[PDB]
From a paper:
To facilitate recombinant human TFIIA production, we designed a single-chain construct (TFIIAs-c) by connecting α, β and γ by flexible linkers, based on atomic coordinates taken from the crystal structure of human TFIIA/TBP/DNA complex. Similarly, a second linker (L2) with sequence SRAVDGELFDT was introduced connecting the α chain with the β chain giving rise to a single-chain TFIIAs-c construct γ-L1-α-L2-βencompassing 240 amino acid residues in total. TFIIAs-c could be produced in high amounts in soluble form in E. coli and purified to homogeneity without any need for refolding steps (see Materials and methods section). We stored highly purified TFIIAs-c at 4⁰C, and observed the formation of needle-shaped crystals in the storage buffer after several weeks. We improved the crystals manually and determined the 2.4 Å crystal structure of TFIIAs-c. The crystal structure revealed a virtually identical conformation of unliganded TFIIAs-c as compared to TFIIA in the TFIIA/TBP/DNA complex. TFIIAs-c was active in a band-shift assay with TBP and adenovirus major late promoter (AdMLP) TATA-DNA similar to purified TFIIA using the classical refolding protocol. The structure was determined by molecular replacement (MR) utilizing software PHASER, with the TFIIA crystal coordinates from the human TBP/TFIIA/TATA-DNA structure used as a search model.
The GTF TFIIA, on the other hand, competes with NC2 for TBP and promotes TBP/DNA interactions in a ternary TFIIA/TBP/DNA complex, facilitating formation of and stabilizing the preinitiation complex (PIC). Interaction of TFIIA with TBP results in the exclusion of negative factors that would interfere with PIC formation, and TFIIA acts as a coactivator assisting transcriptional activators in increasing transcription levels. TFIIA in human cells is made from two precursor polypeptides, TFIIAαβ and TFIIAγ, with TFIIAαβ processed in vivo into two separate polypeptides, α and β, by proteolytic cleavage mediated by the protease Taspase1. Recombinant human TFIIA is typically produced in E. coli by refolding from three separate polypeptides expressed in inclusion bodies, which correspond to the native α, β and γ chains.
Author numbering: 2 to 210
Write the structure that this text describes.
């Protein structure tokens, strides 16, 4: 399970929650590390198995770079379409992990509240490492409540001092280029576009250098 969804509104509110409990001595930094690892699994599996929407996007390719099997792209003048909303953004950064070998598993039911299902899975799946480290249900519920509270705060109108960076964090099936014409097949994506979260199962894109 890839670590790159840790830098998302869901992944950050969890890291901040974990930081507060370390700081208050309620959990060890090493238990925190285990939780993030379980989070990686829940969000990878949740995107692969519960999310179905398609997205199409167009933009101009400004910057491109491949490193350790992760593409990073910057595009200007982007348009992202669904069935059938449209979002424009002057600038977007796409970070994509190699999803060739993943290919996750079976596809379960869609859910009304994807983040809500991920929080439940994680809390259920770290209950036992908590118990084993001497930490009881009340601390586990303190993690759940901090996580959920920080998640709400991300929606606050005056929650940021400045514009938020437009970023897609996802996987790729295939990236190609024929001359100046790039094509993107991306999957299992969380986008933060003008302050707001959007998810995707599959995203297909075009860009010109």
């Amino acid at each position: 399970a890839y670590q790159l969804y840790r830098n998302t509104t869901l992944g950050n509110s969890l890291q901040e929650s974990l930081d507060e409990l370390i700081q208050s001595q309620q959990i060890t930094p090493q238990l925190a590390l285990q939780v993030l690892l379980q989070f990686d699994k829940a969000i990878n599996a949740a995107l692969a198995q519960r999310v179905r929407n398609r997205v199409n996007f167009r933009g101009s390719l400004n910057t491109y770079r491949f490193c350790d099997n992760v593409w990073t792209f910057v595009l200007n003048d982007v348009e992202v379409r669904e069935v059938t909303e449209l979002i424009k953004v002057d600038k977007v950064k796409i970070v994509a992990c190699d999803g060739k070998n993943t290919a996750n598993s079976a596809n379960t039911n869609t859910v009304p509240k994807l983040y809500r299902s991920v929080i439940e899975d994680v809390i259920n799946d770290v209950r036992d490492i908590f118990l084993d480290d001497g930490v009881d249900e009340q601390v586990l519920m303190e993690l759940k409540t901090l996580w959920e509270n920080k998640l709400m705060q991300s929606r606050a109108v005056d929650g940021e001092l400045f514009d938020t960076e437009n970023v897609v964090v996802c996987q790729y099936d295939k990236i190609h280029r024929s001359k100046n014409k790039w094509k993107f097949h991306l999957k299992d994506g969380i986008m933060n576009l003008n302050g707001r979260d959007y998810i995707f199962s599959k995203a297909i894109g075009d860009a010109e250098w």
